[PDB]
Amino acid sequence: REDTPAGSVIQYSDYEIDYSSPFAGGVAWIEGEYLPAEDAKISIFDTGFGKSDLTYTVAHVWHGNIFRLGDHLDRLLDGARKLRLDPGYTKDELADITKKCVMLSQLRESFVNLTITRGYGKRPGERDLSKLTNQVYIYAIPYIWAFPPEEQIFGTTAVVPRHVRRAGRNTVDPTIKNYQWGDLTAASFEAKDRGAGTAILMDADNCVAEGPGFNVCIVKDGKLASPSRNALPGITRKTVFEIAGAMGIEAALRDVTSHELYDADEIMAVTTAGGVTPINTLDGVPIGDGEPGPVTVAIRDRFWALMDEPGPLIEAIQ
Amino acid sequence: AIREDTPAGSVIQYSDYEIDYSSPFAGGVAWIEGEYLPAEDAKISIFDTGFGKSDLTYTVAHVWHGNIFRLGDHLDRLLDGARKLRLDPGYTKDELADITKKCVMLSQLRESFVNLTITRGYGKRPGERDLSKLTNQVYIYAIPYIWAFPPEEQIFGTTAVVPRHVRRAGRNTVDPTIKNYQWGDLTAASFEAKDRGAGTAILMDADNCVAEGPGFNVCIVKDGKLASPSRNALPGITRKTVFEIAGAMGIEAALRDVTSHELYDADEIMAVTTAGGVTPINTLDGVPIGDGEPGPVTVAIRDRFWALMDEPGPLIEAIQY
Amino acid sequence: IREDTPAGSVIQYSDYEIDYSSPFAGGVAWIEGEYLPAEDAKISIFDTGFGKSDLTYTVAHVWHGNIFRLGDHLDRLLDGARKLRLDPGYTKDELADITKKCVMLSQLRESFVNLTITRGYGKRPGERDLSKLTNQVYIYAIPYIWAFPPEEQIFGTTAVVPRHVRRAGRNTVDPTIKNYQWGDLTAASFEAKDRGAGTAILMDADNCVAEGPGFNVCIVKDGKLASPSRNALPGITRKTVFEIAGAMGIEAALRDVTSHELYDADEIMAVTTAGGVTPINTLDGVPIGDGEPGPVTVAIRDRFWALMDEPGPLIEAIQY
Amino acid sequence: AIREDTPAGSVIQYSDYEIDYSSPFAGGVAWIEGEYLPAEDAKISIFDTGFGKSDLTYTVAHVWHGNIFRLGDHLDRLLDGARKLRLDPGYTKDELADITKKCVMLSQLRESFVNLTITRGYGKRPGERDLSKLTNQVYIYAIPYIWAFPPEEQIFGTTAVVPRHVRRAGRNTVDPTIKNYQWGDLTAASFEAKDRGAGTAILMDADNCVAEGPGFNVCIVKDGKLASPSRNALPGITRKTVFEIAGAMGIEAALRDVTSHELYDADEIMAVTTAGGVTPINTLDGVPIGDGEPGPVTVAIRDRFWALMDEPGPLIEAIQY
């Protein structure tokens, strides 16, 4: 755990881990073996390294509840299929290994990763895709924040990069979650150099794409919009649209132009790693009053209440 | 296997020799977290952000008849990319040279694919957020020779398509001017080439200018002058060598935009990379270039390239086995 | 003027005689508030609609003496004018009245009708200050222009995806506002003609379908229709096609259509004011379906032509 | 109408002369369908596909102190672009030169903006579709001098922004390497620069490389070397002149990609164009370039460029009035 704002909707669990188990605090599952995370190593010759030839997903565990594991496995497996990767495990088999990683970890708040790689052959530097055995790697480790708890509650700041744009769907395709962060990293660097929390990247046509590890939603005239084309089909975004529909807020996946981002009444980053993050400022200009907007507060607070409501989560049997 | 067939009497012949397999380094070495290891033992932390974020750069050098080719030039390119990415190898050029050559020496390979990678690395604990807290890692390996195109295709040529569905990432995205493992577009291009029954793909950039192929630079010949893309392409050391050879032969060679029209109107196309050298491209979208057979400039430059690997000079250093 | 159309096809010109005693007979232009015979129609070389192509326009057709969806065209024309910061200085109902008088005076029952709004010119040639330019409205009704010959409307045309050209994106020369800036379209048409094809289907920056030289592209896949949403003119023919599809129980979506989905389509059609709905039989020489007009394309095209003879809100008969 | 204020003692000064208005050509001449007309009277067919399709190319030459600048180069670039578009002017270079110089003479203007346009034209029928059936048209005019930037800004400099919402059309769309009237992107950029209270816009291409501005090339100076975009930009005659001027001063000048990083980090930025020459850019996105005053290479190149309008030589030719 770490500090969250007092009385805010984000609070870690009160519990102590039994460290007599060497799995305590973090677990990896690799080449069919459960390992302490600090022991988790892969072949340097996995073409998931050499070619970043792989897809992944991340799911969070909050108050011992893993959130939308099924929706996560469905997007993982659909992406795997598109890349011609084969986990060699069923959805239900991967669910049980994931859940057992969390259980061994004893973590009630956990960042959880499933990665499917093209893998390695019998020989180092085997090139025939046909001779490479695809690898599944899973791990469960302490909760990770794209933005700190206090920014979740009080908001962060963004810039649109001067020097970077998002890779297009016809290049390094962002519609399949991948580890190819060349643009996303350069954009994070540009945001830190300019003293800003994060970056919102544009596509080739000056429509919003996404940010380094999150989707973007804007609110204008009480209506929500998130980019349809050059962005990951996020599960936090999916959750946010379900929330909005329940609240009677119109929510469209469509092209959001550069004009629309700069003219927004609210902007938010949505992601598995910390949920809903208000963006108070864009290029050093406040959005609305420069404090988290009211649709972003309502959806963020609703998001975190979901994590204690039996329904679309499952308690880890710790 | 330390060897495979090459066309009999061609300019491509592996070395005749025997590896002493009592040594456990025999046939492949990796240098990981300061330790020499048999290639097959070689593992990195899954929490290296060179995996999780492909936050790294690298170079590939080849060894042919016991000679490492242009190691100086590959360490210059590697460390300049590393500096642009704000990576620090924590080793000097001269130190990385010695560690590379000891990998080859220990492997006993006379023909070798050599990789130097520099990753952003990991922190004290897994998924460290703060970049300032990640320790950059360098990995080096020397394994048996890898061919971007088979020996047979080096001599008889390959075929190529321009993808219907794919383009090269631009320098303002995942920047191709810094060697990287971010191959999403290159893997896609390769699949589309394979589905279309072709040897390979030649990717266009956003402006319908030639970029490069999956693991190689493209050079064209038109009316006896040679050209290769300047923008959305790795500054290849093979391409640098090709330009030097053209220059010596009195052939004009230019780094400039090659338009889609220029690719399609070319008298010769060739692929050039460390991993196999100079590959003639006979056809493009099922239309013969020249006569459908390797071009005269391609052949002369390729044969000179392979002659370079046996000539005492500044481009090669003999591994002291 | 009229043209051979296939015998018994849904496309037939009117049978009628023009009175060539009137100098307006066969083609009218409305320029600087004066009605002229098409052939006398001239604009200042110094109109920045020329030297900058700083303008928007629309095209409506007249078929069997009925002008089709003039209100929709005026709405799109004026919506674009406002986004280019142009002022026609005439209301919708005024332009509607001028347009209908152009056709009446032409006596054409089958007509290509242009409305252009340019930034215009100042008191001097070469005026710099955009604010000192008087915006111009130009309107003509001339004989019917075919984006594809009547024969091709009935029996289909052939398409290529250009090797050398892409559609200008919405952040450059914006295709979502009808314009005369055809550099890409003209390039794409030359490449199609050089490759012996009927026309070109252009991609955008991301390998999504944009549109063709003067038309929207619709695909059919597994009985469902789709048409690009981003780098494409919001076509009024496309709009009719969607309305028809809806009434037929055919699902129809404005969305991204990938290069994949174009090459894998069960049907491809072009849709434009200048000739309606054209089957695309072949793409880069490969048959689409059986290489003859697809079933959904035929049903929708034949419906589209029937709309031009049915009393109702989409047509208005010209009072000759 | 024929002169406006220039800064006193500046290198930019209009000529002292009186025009005889007993000529109907005095102060503006157009040549349209083989007839000389007063500018005021110059009209084209609304059915010219140079209008309805902007299917055309053109060039602009300036006259200064009764001298027309590089008319030969302008005719070469015009005719090259017309052949690329499969336009045929129906006149030779020397015939176009004779008519151009005769427009300037009938104008009586010593300072003049001179436009040659070649259009695809019209057929016998309004709205002919077959390009084979269209008669290519030539339109030439000579009107009073036109300033992309006012004289004051030529001497004391202007301010630029990079657009937030607009990019230059690439060479594979509406090609900027062939001078054209298709200003959709450039007009939107000017409107964004005006809304942002800035002198002008410098547009980027798809790869975040500098393209050009609305009606001008961009040059940057860095560590005393000059660079100007090679790809998505008109090969400008002013830029050509600046590069010749740069070389005669011992300043290195490259046509190459200028990244977004190079533009923002420039020691000097200048706009170069036929309509007013070399304009210093003092500020980019409100950030001063150098000391926020015209740069030393900018000033030296500009002052030399205006001296070229008086020196007898191959760059200028006296109009016989």
A183 touching B (Cβ < 8 Å): yes
Buried b (16+ CB within 10 A) or exposed e, D284-312: beeeebbeeebbebbbbbbebbbebbeee
Distance separating alpha carbons of residues D174 and D211, to the nearest angstrom = 13
Q: Count CA atoms closer than 13 A to A168's CA, side-chain side.
A: 25
Q: How far is CA D321 from CA D66, D78, D102, in A?
A: 8, 25, 9
| Number of Cβ within a 10 Å radius of residue B135 | 15
As a residue count, chain D comes to 321
At CA B133, angle to CA B128 and CA B135, rounded to 5? 100
| Number of Cβ within a 10 Å radius of residue A257 | 17
User: Mind listing the domains of chain A with CATH numbers?
Assistant: 27-144 (3.30.470.10), 149-307 (3.20.10.10)
C231 CB neighbours in chain A (<8 A) are 205
Distance separating alpha carbons of residues D22 and A66, to the nearest angstrom = 91
Spatial CB neighbours of D224, under 8 Å, sequence gap ≥ 6? D251, D252, D267, D297
- What one-character-per-residue DSSP string does B229-278 give? -SSSS---HHHHHHHHHHHHHT--EEES--BHHHHHT-SEEEEEETTTEE
Task: Check: CB of residue D211 under 8 Å from CB of residue D176.
Answer: yes
> Measured between CB atoms, which of A205, A206, A257 is closest to C204?
A205
Task: Check: CB of residue B111 under 8 Å from CB of residue B15.
Answer: yes
Task: Check: CB of residue D49 under 8 Å from CB of residue D119.
Answer: yes
Task: Check: CB of residue A235 under 8 Å from CB of residue A251.
Answer: no
| Number of Cβ within a 10 Å radius of residue B71 | 24
Q: Count CA atoms closer than 13 A to A306's CA, side-chain side.
A: 22
Buried b (16+ CB within 10 A) or exposed e, A102-133: bbbbbbbbbbbbbbbbbbbbebbbbbebeebe
Q: Count CA atoms closer than 13 A to C153's CA, side-chain side.
A: 26
Distance separating alpha carbons of residues D218 and D203, to the nearest angstrom = 10
Contact call for C230 and A229, based on CB within 8 A: yes
Task: Mutation target for A interface from C83, C171, C173, C258: give the one with most A CBs within 10 A.
Answer: C171
* Selection from A12, A55, A60 nearest residue A272 by Cα: A60
Task: Check: CB of residue B166 under 8 Å from CB of residue A170.
Answer: yes
Looking at chain C from residue 222 to 241, which residues have their Cβ under 8 Å from any Cβ of chain A? 229-231
The token duo for A177 is 């979650």
Distance separating alpha carbons of residues A49 and A35, to the nearest angstrom = 20
* Selection from D107, D187, D118 nearest residue D145 by Cα: D107
User: What are residue D288's DSSP bridge partners?
Assistant: D283
Distance separating alpha carbons of residues D162 and D164, to the nearest angstrom = 7
- What one-character-per-residue DSSP string does C123-169 give? SSTT---GGGPEEEEEEEEEE---SS-HHHHHH-EEEE--SS--PPP
- What one-character-per-residue DSSP string does A61-77 give? EETTEEESHHHHHHHHH
Show the 3-state SS of C245-275.
Answer: HHHHCCCEEECCCEHHHHHCCCEEEEEECCC
Q: Pairing state of beta strands D217-222 and D200-201?
A: unpaired
Q: What are the helix and strand counts (H, E) for chain A?
A: 8, 16
Task: Check: CB of residue A99 under 8 Å from CB of residue A64.
Answer: no
C304 touching D (Cβ < 8 Å): no
E strand intervals along chain B: 29-32, 35-38, 43-45, 56-64, 67-69, 112-122, 135-144, 158-161, 200-201, 217-222, 225-228, 253-255, 268-273, 277-284, 287-288, 316-318
Q: Pairing state of beta strands D277-284 and D158-161?
A: parallel
User: What are residue C219's DSSP bridge partners?
Assistant: C226, C268
State the angle between helix axes of D296-307 and D237-248 in degrees (0 to 180), rounded to the nearest 10. Answer: 110
Spatial CB neighbours of D76, under 8 Å, sequence gap ≥ 6? D93
Positive/negative CA dihedral, D113, D116, D121, D124: positive
At CA D265, angle to CA D261 and CA D271, rounded to 5? 95
Q: In angstroms, how far apart are the furthest CA atoms of chain A?
A: 60
Spatial CB neighbours of D291, under 8 Å, sequence gap ≥ 6? none
Buried b (16+ CB within 10 A) or exposed e, A38-50: bbbbbbbbbbbbb
H-state helical runs in chain D:
49-52, 71-84, 93-107, 151-156, 184-195, 237-248, 260-264, 296-307
Task: Check: CB of residue B63 under 8 Å from CB of residue B108.
Answer: no
* Selection from A199, C209, C230, C119 nearest residue D188 by Cα: C119
CA-CA-CA-CA torsion for D282, D286, D288, D294, nearest 10 degrees?
0
| Number of Cβ within a 10 Å radius of residue A233 | 17
> Measured between CB atoms, which of C27, C125, C143 is closest to D39?
C125
Distance separating alpha carbons of residues C227 and C254, to the nearest angstrom = 5
Distance separating alpha carbons of residues B188 and A87, to the nearest angstrom = 19
* Selection from B69, B151, B166 nearest residue B112 by Cα: B69
Burial class (CB in 10 A: 0-12, 13-18, 19+), D64: buried
Find where tokens 């000064």 sit: D13
- What one-character-per-residue DSSP string does C45-93 give? TT-HHHHS--EEEEEEEEETTEEE-HHHHHHHHHHHHHHTT---SS-HH
Sequence-separated contacts (24+) of A186-192 with Cβ below 8 Å: A186/A161, A186/B175, A187/A161, A187/A211, A187/A212, A188/A212, A189/B86, A190/A159, A190/A161, A190/A162, A190/A163, A190/A164, A191/A158, A191/A159, A191/A161
Resolution in angstroms for this experimental structure? 2.3
Contact call for D206 and A206, based on CB within 8 A: no
* Selection from C241, C242, C163, C154 nearest residue C197 by Cα: C163
Find where tokens 């093979």 sit: B238
Local structure of residue D318 (DSSP, 8 states): E
Distance separating alpha carbons of residues C20 and C106, to the nearest angstrom = 10
Q: How far is CA B303 from CA B9, B14, B138, D194, in A?
A: 12, 15, 34, 60
User: What are residue C282's DSSP bridge partners?
Assistant: C158, C287
Quick check: helix, strand or coil at residue B91?
A: coil
Write phi, then psi, for B49 (nearest 5 degrees).
Answer: -75, -10
CA Rg value for chain C: 20
D165 CB neighbours in chain A (<8 A) are 206, 257-259
Quick check: helix, strand or coil at residue D227?
A: strand
Distance separating alpha carbons of residues A168 and A230, to the nearest angstrom = 6
Contact call for B208 and C258, based on CB within 8 A: no
The token duo for D288 is 């001063």
Contact call for C171 and A229, based on CB within 8 A: no
Quick check: helix, strand or coil at residue B94?
A: helix
Task: Check: CB of residue B14 under 8 Å from CB of residue B309.
Answer: no
Local structure of residue B183 (DSSP, 8 states): -
Positive/negative CA dihedral, C13, C17, C21, C22: negative
Q: Which strand (E) or helix (H) includes residue B306? A: helix B296-308
Task: Check: CB of residue C115 under 8 Å from CB of residue C100.
Answer: no
As a residue count, chain A comes to 318
Distance separating alpha carbons of residues D214 and D187, to the nearest angstrom = 7
Task: Check: CB of residue A149 under 8 Å from CB of residue A3.
Answer: yes
Task: Check: CB of residue D11 under 8 Å from CB of residue D154.
Answer: no
Task: Check: CB of residue A25 under 8 Å from CB of residue A17.
Answer: yes
Local structure of residue B200 (DSSP, 8 states): E
Write phi, then psi, for A197 (nearest 5 degrees).
Answer: -60, -45
Contact call for A44 and B113, based on CB within 8 A: no
Local structure of residue B125 (DSSP, 8 states): S
What amino acid occupies position B29?
V
The token duo for A224 is 């929500």
| Number of Cβ within a 10 Å radius of residue B291 | 8
Q: How far is CA D70 from CA A19, C110, D317, in A?
A: 84, 51, 8
Buried b (16+ CB within 10 A) or exposed e, A141-173: bbbbbbbbbebbbebbbbbbbbbbbbbbbbbbb
Distance separating alpha carbons of residues A283 and A15, to the nearest angstrom = 41
Distance separating alpha carbons of residues A201 and A198, to the nearest angstrom = 10
D320 touching B (Cβ < 8 Å): no
Looking at chain A from residue 130 to 169, which residues have their Cβ under 8 Å from any Cβ of chain C? 168-169
Q: Pairing state of beta strands C224-227 and C252-254?
A: parallel
Q: How far is CA C189 from CA A313, C163, C166, C271, D121, in A?
A: 56, 12, 12, 16, 17
> Measured between CB atoms, which of D208, D231, D260 is closest to B257?
D231
Distance separating alpha carbons of residues A78 and D319, to the nearest angstrom = 73
C230 CB neighbours in chain A (<8 A) are 205, 207, 229, 255
D127 CB neighbours in chain C (<8 A) are 112, 142-143, 145
Q: Between A and D, how many residue pairs show a Cβ–Cβ distance under 8 A?
A: 21
Contact call for C145 and D129, based on CB within 8 A: yes
Cα B281 from chain centre: 17
Q: Which strand (E) or helix (H) includes residue C282? A: strand C276-283
